[PDB]
Design a protein around this ligand. Structure first.
Ligand code: SAH
Ligand code: SAH
Lengths: 229, 229
């Protein structure tokens, strides 16, 4: 079934607005077909109650069962120099089930902060689009950028993806942790220097196989491993 | 270092051409600088013999060992209706170590075989840039298209990624099979019918956690898990 996101409910009715009425519109959707609507926590199976052109109402036919992410991952991403690449990594972090997304400024990452801050609004909307197709009940929190030199390992287990270092495989890390910190570098990668600071602070360094991946194919690569295990 | 591609080796000199030359100069390589060139199954570390107006000769200094994929994966990707998507799926398939890529014609996927055969050339070239960037010397073979109906569990472990069926957990698959066969669906997934046919054969259905992912994200997820063992 199709899925939409509503930010307002009255009694047992969810209301779509703006972008949603368009999305829902292009979707013909016979007068009474069941489509989902995630609202403040869960997703609700609904049938149209009345359709406009500016706003639409849906009636809750059933509390749909919504699963949560087995692990609480906080992906610390080094902002790619090509910000569009960050559009993917954000949508994807979302479908994969990442609870938190933190942009990082590293020696080789995009450097401007304001541009990163202004990119948030779009980071956010993309999350929404993603929790609709992904049917993800809750959102992915996008945070204010933090400097790579300020990271501290704080999760049950803490990883740093590095292709330059001869690290351990994911299997070797504590895959039985409930919360994780995962630091991925930009297109240019991590400087031998800055990653040494990290392994020293405690971030366990993982080496994926069998080649060098673009930063985004590396992100899903490991998140996939850390969420499915 | 910088890795380039070559299909011309006159002597101990690996010649570069067309776009591979525009990249070389756009990289202002300083004389005696060290870079690599992939040729006939392996990468050689080379120092620039001389960048000609057209060609660009590269002197071989040492034949580097090639690191082959720990697993033998054959990807069966249902061509996505949005063909630009196959651009990234062929790419990521490549840097992940997938050996064979087979485009599939399924009920809810792209259909025009004629187009699939043509956009294939574009893909073969997306592979070379992916080999160069992922220091990958072994070529991913893109085969002629085939439809689901004709698929065969030719490999040891044969999987079918489906979000519609409560298949097995990724962690419970033969994570130590030598060869593999992964079948992924187009945007609309696999219909109960087609999947049930594939499962009807030896194809083991797998379910990823915890949400529904777009095809490209799933391709990465299943293979990132299998390759990193
Ligand atoms: N094989 C691998 N194992 C672990 N991490 C990888 C990886 N391949 C890529 N990554 C991740 O992707 C990020 C950017 S890849 C940077 C590659 C570098 N420019 C080079 O020339 O080799 C890396 O910092 C790391 O976080
Ligand atoms: N969680 C998951 N488990 C297994 N396979 C998945 C998956 N999420 C996506 N896929 C793969 O990605 C393909 C396209 S996603 C299909 C989603 C489906 N049309 C829907 O809206 O419900 C699926 O057919 C499957 O091959």
């Amino acid at each position: 079934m199709h899925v939409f996101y509503s930010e307002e409910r009255r009694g047992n009715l969810l209301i779509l607005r703006e972008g949603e009425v368009k999305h829902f519109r292009v979707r013909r959707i016979e007068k009474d077909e069941e489509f989902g609507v995630i609202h403040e926590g869960k997703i609700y199976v609904c049938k149209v109650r009345r359709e406009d052109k500016r706003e639409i109402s849906c009636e809750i036919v059933e509390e749909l069962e919504t699963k949560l992410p087995p692990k609480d991952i906080t992906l610390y991403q080094s902002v790619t120099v090509d910000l569009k690449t960050m559009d993917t990594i954000v949508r994807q972090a979302t479908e994969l089930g990442v609870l938190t997304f933190v942009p990082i400024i590293s020696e080789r990452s995009f450097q401007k902060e304001e541009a990163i801050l202004k990119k948030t609004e779009k980071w956010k909307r993309i999350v929404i689009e993603a929790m609709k197709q992904s049917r993800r009940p809750i959102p992915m929190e996008i945070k204010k950028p933090v400097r790579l030199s300020d990271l501290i390992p704080e999760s049950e287990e803490n990883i740093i993806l590095d292709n330059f270092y001869e690290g351990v495989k994911p299997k070797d890390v504590n895959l039985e942790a409930k919360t994780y910190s995962v630091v991925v570098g930009p297109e240019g990668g991590f400087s031998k220097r800055e990653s040494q600071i990290l392994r020293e602070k405690g971030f366990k360094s993982v080496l994926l196989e069998p080649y060098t991946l673009r930063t985004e194919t590396a992100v899903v690569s490991i998140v996939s491993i850390l969420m499915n295990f």
